[PDB]
Design an enzyme around this catalytic site. Structure first.
Site, PDB file in Angstrom:
ATOM      1  N   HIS A   1       6.289   6.836   6.711  1.00  0.00           N
ATOM      2  CA  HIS A   1       5.748   6.234   5.308  1.00  0.00           C
ATOM      3  C   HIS A   1       4.918   7.750   4.405  1.00  0.00           C
ATOM      4  O   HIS A   1       4.908   8.734   4.951  1.00  0.00           O
ATOM      5  CB  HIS A   1       4.786   4.888   4.748  1.00  0.00           C
ATOM      6  CG  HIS A   1       3.325   5.601   6.177  1.00  0.00           C
ATOM      7  ND1 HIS A   1       3.595   5.582   6.614  1.00  0.00           N
ATOM      8  CD2 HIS A   1       2.544   6.473   5.664  1.00  0.00           C
ATOM      9  CE1 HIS A   1       2.390   5.762   7.785  1.00  0.00           C
ATOM     10  NE2 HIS A   1       1.246   6.608   6.916  1.00  0.00           N
TER      11      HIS A   1
ATOM     12  N   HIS B   1       1.773   9.041   1.699  1.00  0.00           N
ATOM     13  CA  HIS B   1       1.231   8.906   0.788  1.00  0.00           C
ATOM     14  C   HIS B   1       1.039  10.536  -0.416  1.00  0.00           C
ATOM     15  O   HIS B   1       1.480  10.943  -0.432  1.00  0.00           O
ATOM     16  CB  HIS B   1      -0.590   9.672   1.239  1.00  0.00           C
ATOM     17  CG  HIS B   1      -0.637   8.629   2.424  1.00  0.00           C
ATOM     18  ND1 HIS B   1      -1.040   7.272   2.558  1.00  0.00           N
ATOM     19  CD2 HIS B   1      -0.164   8.119   3.626  1.00  0.00           C
ATOM     20  CE1 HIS B   1      -1.528   6.861   3.593  1.00  0.00           C
ATOM     21  NE2 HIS B   1      -0.281   7.605   4.543  1.00  0.00           N
TER      22      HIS B   1
ATOM     23  N   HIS C   1       1.017  -1.264   0.044  1.00  0.00           N
ATOM     24  CA  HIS C   1       0.155   0.006   0.128  1.00  0.00           C
ATOM     25  C   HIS C   1       0.670   1.348   0.249  1.00  0.00           C
ATOM     26  O   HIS C   1       0.715   2.195  -0.020  1.00  0.00           O
ATOM     27  CB  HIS C   1      -1.468   0.246   1.010  1.00  0.00           C
ATOM     28  CG  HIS C   1      -0.499  -0.217   2.678  1.00  0.00           C
ATOM     29  ND1 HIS C   1      -0.783  -1.468   2.662  1.00  0.00           N
ATOM     30  CD2 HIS C   1      -0.134   0.211   3.810  1.00  0.00           C
ATOM     31  CE1 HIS C   1      -0.568  -2.371   4.069  1.00  0.00           C
ATOM     32  NE2 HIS C   1       0.136  -0.787   4.245  1.00  0.00           N
TER      33      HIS C   1
ATOM     34  N   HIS D   1       4.203  10.690   6.469  1.00  0.00           N
ATOM     35  CA  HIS D   1       3.713  10.542   8.322  1.00  0.00           C
ATOM     36  C   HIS D   1       4.713  10.226   9.058  1.00  0.00           C
ATOM     37  O   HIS D   1       5.723   8.400   8.577  1.00  0.00           O
ATOM     38  CB  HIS D   1       1.989   9.743   8.514  1.00  0.00           C
ATOM     39  CG  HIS D   1       1.127  10.355   7.726  1.00  0.00           C
ATOM     40  ND1 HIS D   1      -0.349   9.247   6.943  1.00  0.00           N
ATOM     41  CD2 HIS D   1       0.661  11.566   7.968  1.00  0.00           C
ATOM     42  CE1 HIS D   1      -0.848   9.908   6.736  1.00  0.00           C
ATOM     43  NE2 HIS D   1      -0.115  11.691   6.893  1.00  0.00           N
TER      44      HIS D   1
ATOM     45  N   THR E   1      -5.328   4.486   7.591  1.00  0.00           N
ATOM     46  CA  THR E   1      -5.493   2.602   7.205  1.00  0.00           C
ATOM     47  C   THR E   1      -5.991   2.109   8.028  1.00  0.00           C
ATOM     48  O   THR E   1      -5.486   2.555   9.677  1.00  0.00           O
ATOM     49  CB  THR E   1      -3.810   2.352   6.122  1.00  0.00           C
ATOM     50  OG1 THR E   1      -3.136   1.513   7.436  1.00  0.00           O
ATOM     51  CG2 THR E   1      -3.246   3.504   5.331  1.00  0.00           C
TER      52      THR E   1
HETATM   53 ZN   LIG Z   1      -0.519   7.689   6.579  1.00  0.00          ZN
END
Ligand SMILES: [Zn+2]
Length: 255
Positions: A90, A92, A60, A115, A195
């Protein structure tokens, strides 16, 4: 769950009912409605002793993991009480420069969002932390397309190596200090994980000031695959969740 048409964010409520709860994340930050809170202390980012271990493609996103067995990279101050350890970070991102961030400012979307995840050291480990309302603290940093970010390049170059889901690469001596903007001014509100399981255990701290990255840095991001090796190629892009309803919650600013 994924970010696709059949398994996307619009579907998560089916396996994760909390998806439609009271303190879900990300949210739109209305700057004119945010409350300046004079009682907010300055943030305290101590990452001088950070120990990175590896980077991995989880299908993801890509995660950079840190050794959190000792207080080596910690966060304190701000709206936080106690010390929170850096466990991972990570991003996005979008398929285009006009989308990719989770949080939005006055409805404006950034190219990506970083993040930094930290867990409250009175709980002993990550697993017990996600069960507490004040369990985790995620530091959110926006990404805009402009000039390259020297400190991000170590990450960029390793991406080739973890192209598909399940790959991981040793990734030591990486210094997260190279990702921070000049100002530490922020917004903060109580929210959830970004998530699944979408647990409502997060104190969100979103930095007002964005870091810039070159077009070719982000492009390298978009070369990633959600799919495992030996399967149809599905580019890892638009792995971001749409804004959720504030539902009463109040956003406080440190400026
Ligand atoms: Zn995140």
């Amino acid at each position: 769950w994924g970010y696709g048409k059949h398994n996307g964010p619009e579907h998560w409520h089916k396996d994760f009912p909390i998806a439609k709860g009271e303190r879900q994340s990300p949210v739109d930050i209305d700057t004119h409605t945010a409350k300046y809170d004079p009682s907010l202390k300055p943030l305290s980012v101590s990452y001088d002793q950070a120990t990175s271990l590896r980077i991995l493609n989880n299908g993801h996103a890509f995660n950079v993991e840190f050794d959190d067995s000792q207080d080596k990279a910690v966060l304190k101050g701000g709206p936080l009480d106690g010390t929170y350890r850096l466990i991972q970070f990570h991003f996005h991102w979008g398929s285009l420069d006009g989308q990719g961030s989770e949080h939005t400012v006055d409805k404006k979307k950034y190219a990506a969002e970083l993040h930094l995840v930290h867990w409250n050291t009175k709980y002993g480990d990550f697993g017990k932390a996600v069960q507490q309302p004040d369990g985790l603290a995620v530091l959110g940093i926006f990404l805009k397309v402009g000039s390259a970010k020297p400190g991000l390049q170590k990450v960029v170059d390793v991406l080739d190596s973890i192209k598909t889901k399940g790959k991981s690469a040793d990734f030591t001596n990486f210094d997260p200090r190279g990702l921070l903007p000049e100002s530490l001014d922020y917004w903060t509100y109580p929210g959830s994980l970004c998530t699944p399981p979408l647990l409502e255990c997060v104190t969100w701290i979103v930095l007002k000031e964005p870091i810039s990255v070159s077009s070719e840095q982000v492009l390298k991001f978009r070369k990633l695959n959600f799919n495992g090796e030996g399967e149809p190629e599905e580019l890892m892009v638009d792995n971001w969740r749409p804004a959720q309803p504030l539902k009463n919650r109040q956003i406080k600013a440190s400026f």
